[model samples]
Target: KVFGRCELAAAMKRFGLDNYRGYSLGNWVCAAKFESNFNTQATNRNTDGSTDYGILQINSRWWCNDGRTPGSRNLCNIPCSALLSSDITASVNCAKKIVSDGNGMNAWVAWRNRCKGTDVQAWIRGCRL
Candidate 1:
């Protein structure tokens, strides 16, 4: 749930997804809804002790290196990578890329689904978003 309707609607608009209605929005929304409860500041700890942080739950500590005033801002203060990807659409695209890249969003999903009344493992298997 990293984005509320307004946020997602804005993201969709950025992606030119004005026609994203019904199931498409529903499915993507379901995934985002499950990912971070729409928390723009969502984060997760990796096994190596680094972390994933914000909205799309990106691992800020690992990505984003712009050499700006402070690198921390890119990694911690903002989801630079995800934001640049596609406003609200970043959530779904991010999930696909991560899956393609071979990491897993299972741990995060497990925690989310468990609270929503679904078995974590079961949902984690297919719920890539």
Candidate 2:
């Protein structure tokens, strides 16, 4: 499932990503756009055979268990399948977990390059909190 920008904004607010770990919802939305184009089922295979999954493009190397990577450590403690569902609660929950590390939202390079410390309000311009 692909999310419209406002729909993603509303969902981010609903799921507590709006201000989690000091990131605005706009930052989250911006990262999602850069990461997976808001496509819930998105997956990209890495050269190391790792995979990125879902709207947040969660990595298999250290986040979810995809049973393909060697000794994949699922820090989110969730099956990779959970992140691909259109429901998105699992994706947001795992994203929160991913951000809780000392790296914060810098956990995703997409956020670092595109959303970090920026006023991304335009990403959610037509959306209500």
Candidate 3:
């Protein structure tokens, strides 16, 4: 909820995500588009009974607290509700850590299915910095 395309692009650039780990900004934008359509409150239950949280669709089983999911790694150490906020700072921080942990954008199945090897520059087209 914090951005549309242009604002999101600017914020991404400001946060140093455009070239983080040599990944293109388009890759990140495309992943966000598919994962949650930029909706901060988006939550999807996977077939495996794991819940995905926020714009990044971070996994509850590994990233955030869903309160009742046992064996949760809770790597982000924050409540899932926190990720649903309009302020995406926590979500972005966690996402950065997730990528640094070697998952890369492949942590999002959406990215692998729709963004990988695709021309994703349009995800940021017309977005002014």
Candidate 4:
């Protein structure tokens, strides 16, 4: 796992994720909870022959090359394994690229379903970031 709740909040602030691309830190926190429980090594195989990698669950189909997924766009120009590291710098950068590429947080289905329009303050509750 990359962080505990408190560490995550502080890291987010340090990484400028408190207001990344104008999205709230709560949104990122919520998505991380539902997507990977803050585990950087998290990965999920999709039925569509794609895989979601790292904390934000970036897809192999578009973001990174896992060497298993065919026809990958690899837009981030990095190995998907890079996303699975304890150091989250590459993953954060890739996520920023994704949001700027037009999907915003909507790139994460978890964010769309569980976080959008919800009372998200609890995501940062007790973190004191």
Highest TM-score against the true fold, candidate? 2
Q: Output the worst ten-in-a-row residue range by lDDT, candidate 4.
A: 1-10
> Whose TM-score is higher: candidate 2's or candidate 3's?
2
How do the candidates rank by lDDT, highest first? 2, 4, 3, 1
TM-score of each: 0.42, 0.95, 0.92, 0.94
Backbone clash pairs for candidate 2 read none
Give me the overall lDDT of model 2: 0.91
| lDDT (10s digit) by residue, model 2, range 16-104 | 88778888888999999999999999999999999999999999999999999997899998889899999999899888888998888
| lDDT of each residue in 42-92, candidate 3, tens digit only | 998887777998888988888888886778899989998888888778888
lDDT of 4 by residue, 1-129 (tens): 667877777777788887788888888888888989999999999998999999889999999999998889999999999999988889888998998988788889999999999987788888766
User: How much lDDT does candidate 1 score?
Assistant: 0.44
- lDDT for 107 in candidate 1 is 31
Show model 1 residue runs off by greater than 4 Å: 6-10, 13-23, 60-96, 102-129
Q: After superposition, how far is residue 28 of candidate 1 from its true place, in Å?
A: 2.5
**Model 3 pairs whose backbones collide:** none
Clashes of each: 9, 0, 0, 0
lDDT of 2 at 38: 91
